[PDB]
Amino acid sequence: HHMKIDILDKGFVELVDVMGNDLSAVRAARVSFDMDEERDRHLIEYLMKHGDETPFEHIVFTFHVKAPIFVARQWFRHRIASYNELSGRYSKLSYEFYIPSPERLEGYKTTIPPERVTEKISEIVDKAYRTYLELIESGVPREVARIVLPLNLYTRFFWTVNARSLMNFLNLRADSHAQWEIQQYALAIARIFKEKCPWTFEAFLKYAYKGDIL
Amino acid sequence: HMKIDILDKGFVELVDVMGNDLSAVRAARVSFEERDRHLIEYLMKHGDETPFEHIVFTFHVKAPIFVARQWFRHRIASYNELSGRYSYEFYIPSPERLEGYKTTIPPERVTEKISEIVDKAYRTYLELIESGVPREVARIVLPLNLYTRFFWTVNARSLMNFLNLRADSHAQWEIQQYALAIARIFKEKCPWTFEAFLKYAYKGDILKEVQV
Amino acid sequence: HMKIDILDKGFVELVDVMGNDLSAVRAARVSFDKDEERDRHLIEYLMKHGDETPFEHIVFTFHVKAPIFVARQWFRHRIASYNELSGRYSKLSYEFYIPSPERLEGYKTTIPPERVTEKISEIVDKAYRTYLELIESGVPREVARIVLPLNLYTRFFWTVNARSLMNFLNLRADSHAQWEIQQYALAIARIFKEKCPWTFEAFLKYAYKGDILKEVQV
Amino acid sequence: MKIDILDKGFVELVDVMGNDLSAVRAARVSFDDEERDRHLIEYLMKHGDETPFEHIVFTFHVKAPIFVARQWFRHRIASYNELSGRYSKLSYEFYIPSPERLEGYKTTIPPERVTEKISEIVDKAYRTYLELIESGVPREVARIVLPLNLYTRFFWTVNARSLMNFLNLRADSHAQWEIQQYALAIARIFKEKCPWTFEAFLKYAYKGDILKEV
């Protein structure tokens, strides 16, 4: 079980592990050891249709995610899940930042060329980072110095989430009303979910999924 | 599938598991031997339990409804149970379950009387079904020692809390037994975490004297 | 102040509530501070676009008396807090839901409905009698009680926020749920409407997935 | 009841359901002796029977820097609403540490100068943000250059048990100083509203240090 999808300039979503597959939901709904394709597919659709989503909780993913803090903050609002975020305490910290490409601004009619917007963002980021390093060099503790860093600082985290919670996540974030950056991560999550649970995923698209972009 | 028999007709069977002791080490370090084992200890020792949320089991449990009802109080877990609306076995305690208590009739007489009421209740239930009574109504006469089955999907942290509450002399003997089988499967799949849990975090009594 | 009798010896009683419809408006706006039409529109907007987090800031506590077969369906709702009666802090008592003949007319049976009631009552009586016999003999309660039927009444305190309550009404205030649980869910709905009228109507109009609360007043 | 924290922060009590007696009613499952009642509260707490305390609930209104809010929001057993432009006016303030914050640390650069550098960065980042907005960059993109010390506001609803778990993790000297201060304010309000429970918590269940010193 291993998949990686690159997101933004330096970000990613990688699959670390999975427990179960579409049949794990079939099994839990029946309380049985079944493994007959047709009737198992029908059952999955049937559960999805009638909003009987508990069986899908017995499918579980672990993801490793690299994303900017503004994205990670919205993400961590999903309470029915487990998070471990990068701290200095158990491994090395690094410092990269999401610089939007000029095409991110297309559609918006801006006073200055998109390339200049991109460059202004780079510049202010570079200044904050250099101030950060300055403070660290002077002996300011990391936990203080780091408050000058911008919301586009990349973080990394593991996320363990069951299929039901994942579908709820997709309903909120895989949507043209979500911020573009968020959507992009949600497409990656959907894509891995589709790979590992095609029947569940297709059933979710047909009957339960509330957004557009999938 | 590791499968452990409990009470007269019950069990705990392992359906699936995701990860192992290293799943917790990877998570704590956010990165895809004795060092890794030492990190587990260090985590458990300092109360940093979140890395263990990244290990997960699914169990198949057959238990008497009185035991299930206590078990289902553990909210940080997922359950799918057989429906009472849509087999019929009953936990009959052995005479030995009673020893330690002075009773005015002998233990084997207690066992017998339990069996008898179960028989009566079961037969009544069959008459009602036979008469057309729907099951969702007819079953309400069945006693709390009726066996049910369920799947249980639980992370290792929420599992250690469950072991904290149920693998302990102060819980009903019956659920201890189920908690011993759970401990046993946990220990098999996640030896380092399990030892570390006993040594630094486990608040109950029995697992420090009942092996596996 | 608010207690509703359910089944033959059951009830739903309201112990406490935090907040009202405006607790949800305040939370959506993140403002500790009133404009009825505008505030009602916000509640409709939240409910219509599926943003139900603001309703988590309204909370209820109930005291509920129900047969164990009902309680077990209820305790499957995990986004909530439960305190069930035990031998520890308070007195136990022993009562049972004996269904009336009406419960079964509608079903074609080969004995009269009253005969069903009579048979359920009998077996309850015998089970209970056996129980008290074992108790008098020294058998501890935790063992002796396993003979008692699933229609034994229990009590609990349930603390639940309005969002989680709405999910519960979705799943239980519905003709596909067992009739006994419908009846509890209708009492929970009535209270919830009395305290949070705006949220309860917006719920029905936009989010409610069941049948009965759209059929049956309060 | 409102407690000021950091330079522009606060914790304010919005609402509370119940008091010490709510846990006693719950434990006994009775809607129907002051000294008996405290004894039960100590008894519950010493034996780890903390479920009765779930029937006491608080709503807070908290103004805090994002770095703080991100650590706070990791407490999953609770309900949050964070300020959005969607339902209310947004504003732009930043946590500048006082020089006493560093006092304790041996720095190459005096504490007031650390304070000044943080302030300088904020001003520059904030001004870059404003330049972008003026240009026609949307807020959702422009705000990504803002530093982690930007204040945010949120409502937090949390039952007493979950609140005690929070105090265990954050009212402790190993927590970052800034969150400790919010944790002390939470604790004070807790103590005010639920004295018997708070007293019993310190005596039997509290795992931290600082609530026993202040």
Side-chain angles (χ1 to χ4, degrees):
Chain A
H1 288 299
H2 199 43
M3 294 187 50
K4 183 172 173 166
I5 307 181
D6 299 275
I7 307 280
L8 307 191
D9 53 353
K10 305 168 189 81
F12 67 70
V13 174
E14 146 180 278
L15 183 61
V16 180
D17 208 346
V18 197
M19 186 174 74
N21 57 25
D22 295 303
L23 295 191
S24 303
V26 170
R27 288 192 282 274
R30 291 182 187 159
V31 200
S32 86
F33 284 75
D34 284 312
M35 289 172 86
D36 199 23
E37 202 213 71
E38 200 181 345
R39 196 162 52 81
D40 300 338
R41 273 202 93 146
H42 187 263
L43 178 55
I44 279 158
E45 298 204 350
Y46 172 96
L47 293 170
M48 200 66 74
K49 268 174 159 143
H50 296 123
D52 182 351
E53 282 190 338
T54 59
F56 301 114
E57 296 179 32
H58 305 274
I59 300 159
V60 188
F61 297 83
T62 301
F63 298 97
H64 176 210
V65 177
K66 187 180 174 186
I69 287 176
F70 75 96
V71 176
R73 282 220 308 141
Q74 288 195 317
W75 201 316
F76 275 43
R77 293 289 305 281
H78 286 261
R79 289 167 291 171
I80 311 301
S82 295
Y83 295 87
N84 271 84
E85 190 161 7
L86 197 60
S87 82
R89 175 46 70 82
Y90 306 127
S91 51
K92 191 193 294 195
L93 308 176
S94 184
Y95 302 94
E96 307 172 287
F97 302 84
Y98 163 57
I99 315 298
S101 80
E103 300 88 334
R104 175 74 178 78
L105 296 151
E106 281 292 317
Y108 299 107
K109 297 171 78 188
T110 59
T111 304
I112 64 174
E115 302 74 13
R116 287 311 184 174
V117 173
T118 277
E119 181 179 32
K120 276 159 174 269
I121 294 185
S122 278
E123 277 167 9
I124 190 69
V125 169
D126 171 83
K127 171 67 189 211
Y129 183 49
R130 284 161 37 238
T131 300
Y132 167 78
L133 292 173
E134 205 168 293
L135 296 182
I136 290 296
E137 208 175 30
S138 301
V140 178
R142 260 166 255 282
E143 67 181 9
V144 167
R146 74 178 292 269
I147 76 184
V148 302
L149 296 177
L151 290 160
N152 65 341
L153 174 66
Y154 277 97
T155 188
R156 287 189 297 106
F157 62 100
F158 276 44
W159 190 43
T160 294
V161 62
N162 73 44
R164 180 184 174 177
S165 181
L166 187 158
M167 278 179 312
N168 177 67
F169 172 92
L170 291 178
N171 282 334
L172 301 174
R173 312 309 197 163
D175 192 74
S176 64
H177 299 70
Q179 188 166 344
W180 187 79
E181 285 86 356
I182 296 299
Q183 295 186 20
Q184 297 311 291
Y185 278 93
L187 293 170
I189 293 298
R191 171 78 192 88
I192 292 156
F193 178 41
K194 178 184 191 162
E195 188 65 25
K196 299 280 165 197
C197 302
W199 296 351
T200 303
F201 182 74
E202 192 162 67
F204 167 72
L205 287 195
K206 282 183 157 168
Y207 303 116
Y209 163 70
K210 297 181 146 217
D212 26 355
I213 63 172
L214 296 176
Chain B
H1 301 287
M2 294 192 70
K3 188 189 161 182
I4 308 158
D5 297 302
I6 306 146
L7 308 185
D8 53 351
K9 294 144 196 128
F11 62 76
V12 171
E13 186 183 26
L14 184 60
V15 177
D16 211 340
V17 49
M18 176 176 74
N20 57 36
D21 293 302
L22 299 184
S23 286
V25 158
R26 285 182 316 174
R29 294 174 180 149
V30 191
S31 195
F32 186 59
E33 184 162 72
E34 72 264 346
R35 199 64 204 73
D36 292 2
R37 203 194 162 101
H38 186 28
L39 183 49
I40 294 303
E41 299 206 62
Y42 180 95
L43 298 168
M44 201 68 72
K45 175 196 169 117
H46 296 277
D48 185 358
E49 294 189 318
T50 61
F52 305 103
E53 298 186 26
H54 301 281
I55 301 157
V56 185
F57 302 78
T58 306
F59 300 88
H60 187 210
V61 182
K62 170 171 171 192
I65 293 185
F66 69 100
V67 163
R69 284 222 313 131
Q70 294 181 355
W71 200 315
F72 274 53
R73 296 304 299 287
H74 287 265
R75 287 168 284 181
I76 304 188
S78 295
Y79 304 82
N80 268 284
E81 181 168 14
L82 290 160
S83 169
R85 307 180 68 202
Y86 330 102
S87 115
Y88 301 93
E89 300 162 290
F90 298 86
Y91 163 58
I92 312 297
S94 69
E96 205 187 324
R97 167 78 177 85
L98 283 312
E99 83 181 2
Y101 293 101
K102 217 181 68 240
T103 72
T104 317
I105 55 183
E108 33 290 311
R109 231 311 190 173
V110 179
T111 290
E112 171 191 310
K113 285 183 185 294
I114 293 180
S115 256
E116 247 163 83
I117 195 51
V118 163
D119 287 22
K120 291 184 155 180
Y122 183 59
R123 219 131 41 193
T124 308
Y125 165 78
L126 298 179
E127 283 184 40
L128 299 172
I129 294 304
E130 212 106 63
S131 290
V133 176
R135 279 166 287 174
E136 67 173 28
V137 174
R139 313 240 230 214
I140 75 190
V141 312
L142 298 172
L144 289 160
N145 69 339
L146 173 63
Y147 274 97
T148 190
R149 297 188 293 107
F150 62 97
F151 273 41
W152 190 45
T153 287
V154 62
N155 72 53
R157 179 181 186 180
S158 171
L159 183 60
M160 286 181 287
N161 182 73
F162 166 94
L163 291 186
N164 274 345
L165 301 161
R166 307 307 187 177
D168 189 311
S169 68
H170 300 59
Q172 198 171 337
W173 183 80
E174 282 84 2
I175 191 154
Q176 307 182 26
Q177 304 313 286
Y178 278 89
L180 285 179
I182 289 296
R184 181 170 225 304
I185 291 164
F186 182 18
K187 177 172 173 184
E188 263 260 52
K189 290 300 151 182
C190 299
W192 302 353
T193 298
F194 182 78
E195 295 311 333
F197 167 60
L198 294 188
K199 176 175 195 162
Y200 302 96
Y202 167 61
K203 314 170 193 157
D205 49 27
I206 65 185
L207 287 171
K208 276 168 304 195
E209 68 184 29
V210 177
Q211 75 205 255
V212 281
Chain C
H1 218 208
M2 295 192 83
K3 189 175 192 189
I4 302 161
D5 291 345
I6 313 288
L7 303 188
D8 62 347
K9 307 173 183 89
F11 56 76
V12 174
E13 181 170 46
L14 181 70
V15 173
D16 213 346
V17 51
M18 188 172 68
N20 58 20
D21 297 300
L22 295 183
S23 297
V25 160
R26 288 180 208 113
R29 290 178 184 149
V30 190
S31 87
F32 187 12
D33 297 79
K34 177 197 158 55
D35 179 3
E36 197 181 73
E37 291 96 328
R38 283 211 191 179
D39 294 340
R40 273 192 91 143
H41 189 223
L42 178 54
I43 292 301
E44 295 213 329
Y45 185 90
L46 299 174
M47 198 71 72
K48 175 178 192 191
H49 298 295
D51 184 14
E52 282 193 31
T53 306
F55 305 103
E56 300 190 25
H57 305 272
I58 294 161
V59 186
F60 294 83
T61 308
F62 297 95
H63 181 211
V64 174
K65 183 171 170 193
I68 289 168
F69 72 96
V70 174
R72 279 181 80 223
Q73 297 173 7
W74 205 316
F75 285 32
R76 298 293 307 275
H77 299 254
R78 288 162 290 172
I79 313 301
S81 298
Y82 299 87
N83 261 274
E84 183 169 9
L85 222 142
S86 69
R88 269 191 122 176
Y89 310 113
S90 59
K91 231 316 206 269
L92 302 199
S93 71
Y94 293 95
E95 292 189 283
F96 302 84
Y97 161 63
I98 302 298
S100 74
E102 289 77 10
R103 178 63 183 75
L104 304 138
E105 31 170 288
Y107 295 89
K108 304 306 177 63
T109 58
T110 70
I111 59 184
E114 331 75 71
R115 211 52 253 291
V116 172
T117 295
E118 180 181 3
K119 288 182 193 290
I120 293 173
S121 196
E122 176 171 63
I123 196 67
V124 163
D125 191 60
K126 278 175 177 186
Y128 182 56
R129 174 180 291 269
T130 300
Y131 170 77
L132 289 166
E133 203 187 324
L134 299 167
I135 290 297
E136 258 225 307
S137 299
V139 182
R141 280 182 216 88
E142 69 168 32
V143 173
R145 72 183 297 275
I146 80 187
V147 314
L148 296 180
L150 291 159
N151 66 340
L152 178 64
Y153 275 98
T154 192
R155 307 195 273 116
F156 64 96
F157 269 44
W158 188 40
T159 285
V160 61
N161 71 51
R163 175 184 186 177
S164 178
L165 185 160
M166 283 184 285
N167 184 57
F168 171 90
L169 291 176
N170 271 338
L171 297 165
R172 305 312 186 169
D174 186 64
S175 79
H176 301 87
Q178 182 160 352
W179 181 83
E180 286 82 3
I181 218 173
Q182 304 187 23
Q183 306 318 288
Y184 281 93
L186 289 168
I188 291 295
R190 168 158 349 132
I191 293 167
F192 172 45
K193 170 177 178 194
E194 184 62 37
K195 304 290 163 189
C196 296
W198 301 347
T199 297
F200 178 80
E201 295 287 319
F203 172 64
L204 295 195
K205 185 174 176 176
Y206 293 112
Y208 175 59
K209 311 179 169 184
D211 35 20
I212 64 178
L213 296 170
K214 285 209 292 284
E215 274 311 295
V216 173
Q217 197 160 332
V218 293
Chain D
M1 212 187 331
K2 181 196 220 183
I3 301 178
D4 298 328
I5 324 282
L6 312 189
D7 46 356
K8 300 163 194 91
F10 61 75
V11 174
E12 171 168 76
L13 182 68
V14 176
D15 210 349
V16 56
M17 186 175 66
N19 58 27
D20 296 306
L21 301 181
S22 297
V24 171
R25 287 188 214 89
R28 297 175 180 145
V29 196
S30 164
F31 178 94
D32 213 311
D33 192 329
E34 168 154 315
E35 163 267 319
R36 270 298 193 288
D37 290 339
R38 289 190 76 144
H39 194 260
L40 179 53
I41 290 189
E42 301 207 354
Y43 178 104
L44 294 172
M45 196 75 70
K46 81 171 40 164
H47 293 283
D49 189 350
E50 319 134 60
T51 63
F53 305 104
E54 299 181 33
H55 306 271
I56 296 153
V57 179
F58 293 81
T59 306
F60 303 89
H61 181 203
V62 169
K63 180 183 169 185
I66 282 169
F67 72 96
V68 171
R70 284 224 307 150
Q71 296 170 26
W72 204 313
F73 278 34
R74 296 289 313 274
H75 292 264
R76 287 164 292 176
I77 308 301
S79 294
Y80 299 84
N81 274 263
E82 182 163 3
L83 191 60
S84 69
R86 188 66 220 174
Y87 306 122
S88 24
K89 40 215 246 60
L90 301 183
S91 45
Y92 298 98
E93 310 183 276
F94 300 86
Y95 166 61
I96 313 305
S98 76
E100 293 60 40
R101 181 58 176 86
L102 287 317
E103 175 277 309
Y105 286 91
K106 294 264 80 59
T107 59
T108 308
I109 227 83
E112 299 76 12
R113 195 55 182 156
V114 173
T115 290
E116 179 173 16
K117 288 170 188 269
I118 291 166
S119 204
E120 177 213 345
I121 270 308
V122 158
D123 182 71
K124 294 201 177 144
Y126 178 59
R127 180 161 313 109
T128 303
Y129 169 72
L130 292 183
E131 285 183 8
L132 300 178
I133 299 303
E134 285 175 20
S135 250
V137 176
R139 286 172 195 177
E140 74 176 2
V141 170
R143 76 186 289 283
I144 80 179
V145 310
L146 290 175
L148 289 159
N149 58 351
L150 176 65
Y151 278 99
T152 187
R153 301 190 283 105
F154 63 98
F155 269 40
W156 186 44
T157 294
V158 59
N159 77 40
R161 176 173 189 187
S162 186
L163 186 159
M164 288 186 273
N165 182 60
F166 174 91
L167 293 181
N168 279 341
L169 290 153
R170 309 312 197 171
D172 188 82
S173 61
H174 306 112
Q176 170 155 7
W177 185 78
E178 284 79 11
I179 201 142
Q180 300 183 24
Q181 300 296 299
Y182 280 93
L184 292 174
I186 295 297
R188 272 164 178 270
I189 292 156
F190 186 26
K191 166 168 180 215
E192 193 64 36
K193 292 290 148 170
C194 300
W196 302 343
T197 302
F198 182 67
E199 176 72 77
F201 174 64
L202 288 195
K203 279 222 77 190
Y204 304 109
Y206 171 61
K207 307 176 94 186
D209 43 22
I210 71 176
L211 294 179
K212 287 168 182 162
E213 296 174 300
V214 188

